[PDB]
């Protein structure tokens, strides 16, 4: 019931959220196309007993007033849309993009989400779907009796057939670029939904208008730096212990107050 | 430069220098980690008090 | 300590007589000029040609 | 930071497989020698990726 | 509230500064042309309860009065301008200085800074600049179609032109010296500036008036002995913990006193 107690509670909550985001980053270190998050903290309002620069006299004004903080709160957890390392998998339908852009995916309920993890497959109808049953937006269909699937530098997916001696242009695979990539609202299963903070998507072919380039047989690993999370955990643990010490000091002070 | 047909250029990367630089880098990294550990230990000792 | 940027050492490498006909090497400073599909212009030193 | 080392291991293994295939395919009359070709990669800047 | 507590607090602060300079030395152990730091402390004032040598009686004097110390303060933190080991990079645009002296650099604002690390590059316009876009004060400009750049022990620089098989001179690299090298004001990006503590800079050609020579293809490593940093760190940790123990003892005494 004292101000210091609420301040220390806010500090403990901030440290707990920081530890939560660190643990979440460490958990999915080996999730393809994952982007790490970092939390930014902001202080609360200030109680002013004496206003700074107040007209304390006819001529003299206080250089600095009396202001007491009220704690700290987390304001946002921003994603770091950097470029992850590319790996080799030597699979026909594993595509990794370099640069910027997102594959579009048709959700079952009729809306559309966006994904960065390129690891596709084929369903029983030949549609080029993602891992999870969701199908891509341009709806590329792979015919049966196909021998090989080739994806060029740009998004022209072609299929080599047994009795044609020449690949047949099955379809085009574009991608959409947002101008507020950090603003996308993420949901489960490596999908992002367009929101107000993120701009309107504008689909374009890869390699043009700032879009990325497609590579077949590659996968983009998460951009999680393991060697820094240990140091962050040490720092977070120390801060949490310090704030707990502050709470204990306040409690002992109050107890000595009420023992008389 | 003057063109030379029927030849290719190497990578001008020397293994001998790279290996010793790697050893030195590992030692420096370990020293910095030791400094981190020492600072954390003195902070903990202060916390207990 | 702040990293002040990496740099690439442009010392000439050791030329090796691979053979073939569509392969060239440069003995001093110089870059082959290539173009992309978008029209952008790049510069390289790899001799492999086909 | 294992990605670069893993890529280097894969490249070296591919080169060794090519050499082994070439040496094994000797005395095959209608055979042409093979040769591997590598290429450096750079996603952003100031750091290589294998 | 207790003089012992304040004295122990000052001791803790001094040990913290010592540990900080140790960490700073170890962090940039691979920085070229870096000079390690060393902190020097001194005792604070003394409260004289009984003046030493006081006239105790008509003919007797106190051999030594009662004096109480009040802590320790870090009087200074100075560079140790030794000569770092010379490496072998076999590059044509990095010069190591043997002996004393600094290269002069024109800062963007207009003043002059001084550096010890010589590892130069060329700007887009042909000027010889240090890593960071700062050009050399005498304004050495490398012409185009340059086959090689040669720098002798003296400051003279030459460039081998494509034709005429005759090298030409395009400038000279003089070195500046100071009366007090430890008084230079260090700033970021591995630079120093002149202050009142150091003397007025004097220019000199290399090899004259005690100025060092120039070696091309070599670079100067930091004079940080990593062997001594470990033992200094152990001593720092021990002293810090001992001062913390002193604070704990004083707090125990106060807590016991308040229980009356």
Swiss-Prot record, chains A, E:
The keyword DNA-binding does not apply. GO terms for cellular component: bacterial-type flagellum; bacterial-type flagellum basal body, distal rod. Keywords: Bacterial flagellum. Its main location: other. The keyword 4Fe-4S does not apply. It comes from the Bacteria. It is found in: Bacterial flagellum basal body. GO terms for biological process: bacterial-type flagellum-dependent swarming motility. PROSITE patterns: FLAGELLA_BB_ROD. NCBIfam families: FlgEFG_subfam, flgG_G_neg. Belongs to the flagella basal body rod proteins family. The basal body constitutes a major portion of the flagellar organelle and consists of four rings (L,P,S, and M) mounted on a central rod. The rod consists of about 26 subunits of FlgG in the distal portion, and FlgB, FlgC and FlgF are thought to build up the proximal portion of the rod with about 6 subunits each. This is Flagellar basal-body rod protein FlgG. The gene is flgG.
UniProtKB/Swiss-Prot annotation, chain B:
It is found in: Bacterial flagellum basal body. It comes from the Bacteria. Belongs to the flagella basal body rod proteins family. This is Flagellar hook protein FlgE. It comes from Salmonella typhimurium (strain LT2 / SGSC1412 / ATCC 700720).
Curated annotation (Swiss-Prot), chain C:
It is found in: Bacterial flagellum basal body. It comes from the Bacteria. Belongs to the flagella basal body rod proteins family. This is Flagellar hook protein FlgE. It comes from Salmonella typhimurium (strain LT2 / SGSC1412 / ATCC 700720).
């Amino acid at each position: 019931m004292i101000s210091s107690l609420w301040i220390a509670k806010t500090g403990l909550d901030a440290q707990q959220t920081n530890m939560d985001v660190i643990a979440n980053n460490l958990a999915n270190v080996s999730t393809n196309g994952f982007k790490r998050q970092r939390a930014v903290f902001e202080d609360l309002l200030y109680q002013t007993i004496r206003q700074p620069g107040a007209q304390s006299s006819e001529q003299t004004t206080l250089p600095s007033g009396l202001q007491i903080g009220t704690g700290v709160r987390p304001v946002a957890t921003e994603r770091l849309h950097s470029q992850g390392n590319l790996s080799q998998t030597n699979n026909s339908k594993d595509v990794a993009i370099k640069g910027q852009g997102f594959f579009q995916v048709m959700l079952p309920d009729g809306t559309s989400a966006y994904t960065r993890d390129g690891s596709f497959q084929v369903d029983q109808n030949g549609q080029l779907v993602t891992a999870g049953g969701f199908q891509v937006q341009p709806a590329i269909t792979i015919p049966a009796n196909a021998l090989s699937i080739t994806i060029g530098r740009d998004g022209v997916v072609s299929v080599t057939q047994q009795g044609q001696a020449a690949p047949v242009q099955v379809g085009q695979l574009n991608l959409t670029t947002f101008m507020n990539d950090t603003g996308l609202e993420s949901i489960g299963e490596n999908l992002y939904i367009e929101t107000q903070s993120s701009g309107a998507p504008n689909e374009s072919t890869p390699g043009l208008n700032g879009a990325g380039l497609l590579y077949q047989g590659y996968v983009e690993t998460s951009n999680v730096n393991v060697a820094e999370e240990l140091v962050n955990m040490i720092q977070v643990q120390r801060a949490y212990e310090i704030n707990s010490k502050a709470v204990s000091t306040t409690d002992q002070m109050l107890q000595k107050l009420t023992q008389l | 430069g003057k063109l030379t047909n029927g030849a290719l250029e190497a990578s001008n990367v020397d293994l001998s220098k790279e290996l010793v630089n790697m050893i030195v880098a590992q030692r420096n990294y370990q020293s910095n980690a030791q400094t981190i550990k020492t600072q954390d230990q003195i902070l903990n000792t202060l916390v207990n008090l | 300590v702040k990293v002040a940027g990496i740099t690439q050492d442009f010392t000439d490498g050791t030329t090796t007589n691979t053979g073939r006909g569509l392969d060239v090497a440069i003995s001093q400073n110089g870059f082959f000029r290539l173009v992309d599909s978008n029209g952008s212009v790049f510069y390289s030193r790899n001799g492999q040609f086909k | 930071s294992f990605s670069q080392a893993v890529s280097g291991l894969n490249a070296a293994a591919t080169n060794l497989d090519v050499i082994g295939n070439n040496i094994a395919n000797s005395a095959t009359y209608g055979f042409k020698s093979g040769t591997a070709s590598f290429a450096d990669m750079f996603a952003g800047s100031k750091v290589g990726l294998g």
